[PDB]
Design a binder for these strands. Sequence first.
RNA 1: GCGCGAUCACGCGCAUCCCCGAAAGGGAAUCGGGUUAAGAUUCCCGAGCCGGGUGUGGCGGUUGACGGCGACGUGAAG
RNA 2: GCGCGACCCCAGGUCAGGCGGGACUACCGCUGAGUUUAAGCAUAUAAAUAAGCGGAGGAGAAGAAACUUACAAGGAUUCCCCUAGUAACGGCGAGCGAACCGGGAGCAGCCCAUCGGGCGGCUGUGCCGUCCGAGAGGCGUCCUCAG
Lengths: 124, 51, 151, 122, 194
Amino acid sequence: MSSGKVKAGELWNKSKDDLTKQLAELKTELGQLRIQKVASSGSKLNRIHDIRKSIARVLTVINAKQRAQLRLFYKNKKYAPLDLRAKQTRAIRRRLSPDEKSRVLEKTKKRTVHFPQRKFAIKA
Amino acid sequence: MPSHKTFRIKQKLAKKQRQNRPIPYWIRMRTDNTIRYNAKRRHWRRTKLGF
Amino acid sequence: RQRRILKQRLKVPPALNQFTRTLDKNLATNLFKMLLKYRPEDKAAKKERLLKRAQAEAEGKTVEAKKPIVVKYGLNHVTYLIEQSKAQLVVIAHDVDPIELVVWLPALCRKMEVPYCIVKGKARLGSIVHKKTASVLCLTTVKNEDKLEFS
Amino acid sequence: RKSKKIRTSVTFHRPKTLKKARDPKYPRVSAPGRNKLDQYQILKYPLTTESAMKKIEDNNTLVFIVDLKADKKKIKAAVKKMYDIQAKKVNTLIRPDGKKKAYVKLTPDYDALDVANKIGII
Amino acid sequence: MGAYKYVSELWRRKQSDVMRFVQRVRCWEYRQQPAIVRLTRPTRPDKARRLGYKAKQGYVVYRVRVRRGGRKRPVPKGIVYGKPKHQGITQLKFQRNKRSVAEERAGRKLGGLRVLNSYWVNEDSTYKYFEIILVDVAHSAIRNDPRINWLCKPVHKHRELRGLTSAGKKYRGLRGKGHTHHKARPSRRATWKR
RNA sequence: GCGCGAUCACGCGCAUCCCCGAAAGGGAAUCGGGUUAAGAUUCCCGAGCCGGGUGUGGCGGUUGACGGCGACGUGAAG
RNA sequence: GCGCGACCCCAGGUCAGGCGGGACUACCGCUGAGUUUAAGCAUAUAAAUAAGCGGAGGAGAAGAAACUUACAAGGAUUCCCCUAGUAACGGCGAGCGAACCGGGAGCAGCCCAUCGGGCGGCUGUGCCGUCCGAGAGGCGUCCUCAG
């Protein structure tokens, strides 16, 4: 539109192509709120706050899209030093994820070791 | 010569210099509490600059 | 200026510091006992060929018709098939460091009357036992219709 | 082709003189990560002081305040894109602001006065 | 059992038969080679096979070279300064053993790996020689082996240093159990001197 | 090995390394005039030059330069 | 008296995959003082402290007997309580200073001495297709039987 914007949901329902034109327009207008700082108007107050957010919303939203897209392309394939950040995050959490516990109790001398019971009765 | 030049001390000295300004009339008003005598505000004659 | 240029390891070392003394070790010493002598390898090559045709006469159907051959490579298996007294001829490599790995067998085999051959190099013994690695020792436990050439 | 039979006589035939071969490299397959678009806005605002304006009139040169990881080549590019003008020299200062003050001298083909008017500055 | 008994029998007898010849000859090597030596073979497979040796990835064996003698204590020629029950320079000998120092050196240089155990590979007349087993934690083959995945656990990092090696238990007096053992178990700092 | 040619892509040669360490040791190139409240050999106005890096033509020359006894003056890898 | 391709030891590079180097307050592991006390002081004491150093975890560390023992039984290991200011040490001065056991806190016994890597496939702590490198013994009625 010709009036300022935005909602979070509106950006999300725009294409990659649309949002960057929107990011374009926003820097340009922001650039105006810089010369309009010499003017010092209260309209350049409210607006210079709220445009700042709109830039941040477009920048985040596109990043999410790209991460999601990458994850979908690669869930077919093999991948990731980046999503590997996220799964660990990090060195302590890398130590906690071998995994250790299931594997440690796995193998050698193990079937009859405990009290038996109920199970045998059910299958009668 | 320059007038000792290096950017890396020179900027940070200029930051402390911008940081040593008056409190802005407003923060006295909304305000919570204080005789707001700012206070980390430093002077050409007295005490001595630090890094 | 010109003439010669010739011959690194005779006059311009250092160039290698680990191995020169390693040669000197083989050649020199002092010293008390123990490992030497035979192979003009004519009588290596026949042993090696009748070691290759001691993995490679293997058929052996489902049926106990005859499973032919066993050859086993590696020090422990060679010790145990001498001790379990059905090795028909063992082979030793000369090229063994630690020597300690192979010292036991010539004394042990002569207490079992199991014959032993001493092939010059460890790698050829591993290739002719059909390994993909060198072998310090090997055995035949049971040959394969060759009895006369084996004797 | 070159036979190490040649190579053996080459080690024998050189007292000192130094070694030699050269060799390639290659990437794997696990795909290095990171797709980016890290961008700073060099230009922040046209600077405004009385001293700038005289510089507009006297000697055809606009005055911007710029970022602290500026240069002169990126600003000579940045100004070119966003204001449609060729710039001939750029002069660069750290300021007691913490900020970088840049004087941008322009071509006479498009004068600082009517470059300025649509984002007026004094 | 097997072949591993013979070399074990040899190594008793450092001074005698084939072992004094062959290992004095490997010291021509051992003096030449550094205070880090990684090797791909254990010298003793017997005492590798009885301190934890499986050939399997992540396993390395390494030789460490440690000086003979005690410890000499700073500062000489600006000397203490204190009353003579506490003056001592060469007189004191460390109450860590020379085997544990070798464990420390090794684990410092191979920092991504953890010492399992160690053994003796001789002495001449100023060096004492050890060969030490360090085992990768971080690779799958150690993890998917339940005989050696106990090392992996985060509590076990830098274990040589905290004295949890076999050598570290032995110099800590933890060889006994009962009578006597009373000042060693569970720790030499244990009661806080209450 | 490093270093260099080398265009087609590839091979060849050698010895003691590599950064910091003087804004007053060593060092590629700028002056005169003007102007600002406050800069200025720094911007301008005039004029010059350097460094670094691709094209162009005048021609000075061409089986790699004449002249002046002489001194001396007016290609190119290993 | 000899060159070559190949096996096998060492070394340098290389990109890959994987880990580690610093931090959080104390807790938690070596080296190692002095004031002080013994009305002095040198063994002794302060004190294996403090400190320095290194390194770990959410707890560490210690663990299933070449144990205790003073009998005749117990039965991994910490810790709490006390055994005890006993035994033992020591100008046998001043001081130092426990263990077995006994009952609890809580309990558990086991374990040594086909693996991984590469692509492809998936419902990716997994398995399949493939390529590559590297407490034991005999006999017996049976009871028990993974997930």
